[PDB]
């Protein structure tokens, strides 16, 4: 072992001590109204979660059309999606709580 | 103070000089059509912002249904959302402009 190479390796290793991962991957355990997320043997509650606005917005049950011919129709929202147990999400850590950005599926 | 421990601490500190934060957090000052974002005492204009496509797409005022029984209906879009002043966003820096990915709310 040449001491110069060992010193260079030591510098490269010790330079990484303070670094933190960019993002986290998590698995859901409960449905969206009472959301629970597990990552790194830690379960998050609703006090610890910031979520994307579109996720909350799209869970609208029903909406109505404008009137015409003295009658109206009711249309059921087809974009509603409550996360099932076992799904994967991408999340970013902001201070003391995690921010959920999107849900990933294999296409 | 043992000099070896001080040297190791110096290496750990100087290894972090070139690192840059992964993401940025910003607060809006003007509504979506003329968007203004403030971060780190810097105000961003429309020349400095790249935005998600869905954010632009969802601000569609109205759409229509197919014809049937010799009549049609007009349905107003219920997913339209213009950001209000004081909302929080997650943004990533690409070259000289920031890219806005999603808006975060506490659920």
């Amino acid at each position: 072992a040449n001491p110069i190479n060992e010193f260079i390796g030591i510098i490269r290793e010790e330079g990484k001590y303070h670094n933190q991962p960019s993002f986290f991957i998590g698995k859901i355990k409960s449905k969206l109204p009472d959301l629970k997320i597990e990552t790194n043997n830690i379960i998050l509650e609703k006090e610890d979660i910031l979520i994307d606005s579109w996720m909350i917005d799209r869970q609208l049950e029903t909406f109505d059309t404008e009137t015409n011919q003295e009658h109206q129709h009711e249309v059921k929202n087809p974009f509603i999606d409550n996360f099932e147990s076992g799904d994967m999400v991408i999340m970013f850590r902001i201070g003391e709580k995690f921010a959920v950005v999107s849900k990933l599926v294999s296409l | 103070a043992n000099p070896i421990n001080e040297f190791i601490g110096i290496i750990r500190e100087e290894g972090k000089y070139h690192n840059q934060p992964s993401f940025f957090i910003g607060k809006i000052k003007s509504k979506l059509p003329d968007l203004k974002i403030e971060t780190n005492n810097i105000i961003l204009e429309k020349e400095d912002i790249l935005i998600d496509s869905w954010m632009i797409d969802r601000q569609l005022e109205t759409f229509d249904t197919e014809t049937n029984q010799e009549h049609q209906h007009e349905v107003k879009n219920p997913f339209i959302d213009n950001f209000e002043s004081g909302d929080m966003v997650i943004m990533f820096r690409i070259g000289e402009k920031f890219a806005v990915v999603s808006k975060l709310v506490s659920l």
């Binding site: 001491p3 110069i4 060992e6 010193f7 030591i10 | 070896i4 421990n5 190791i8 601490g9």
Partner: peptide, 23 residues
């Protein structure tokens, strides 16, 4: 060759300190 011996001693000391744990 003095630089090589000095570097060897410094490397050994740093490895021992890493094993012991440094705050």
């Amino acid at each position: 060759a003095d630089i090589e011996k000095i570097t060897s001693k410094l490397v050994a000391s740093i490895q021992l300190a890493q094993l012991g744990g440094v705050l």
